[PDB]
Design a protein around this ligand. Structure first.
Ligand code: NA
Ligand code: NA
Ligand code: NA
Ligand code: NA
Ligand code: NA
Ligand code: NA
Ligand code: NA
Lengths: 30, 30, 30
């Protein structure tokens, strides 16, 4: 149950921090 | 347990919407 | 609350993926 969705939320957290940076890239160059 | 998960998924739910706006805005700006 | 949680991160993982795609698209327009 919960160790499965925690590692998903972990994955989610990583992704969010990833995309956040990407958007910063785009915005500073666009 | 389930407290911290719903906690973080709201962080994530809002992060993800926030990004969707940045992407929408950025699409207009290219 | 457990099942709603697991399905909520479902949407998140899937929106995470389309943001990667839409931010990848915007990369070579800027
Ligand atoms: Na996996
Ligand atoms: Na509550
Ligand atoms: Na936090
Ligand atoms: Na969207
Ligand atoms: Na996924
Ligand atoms: Na992935
Ligand atoms: Na790049």
């Amino acid at each position: 149950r919960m160790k499965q969705l925690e590692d998903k939320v972990e994955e989610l957290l990583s992704k969010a921090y990833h995309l956040e940076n990407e958007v910063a890239r785009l915005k500073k160059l666009v």
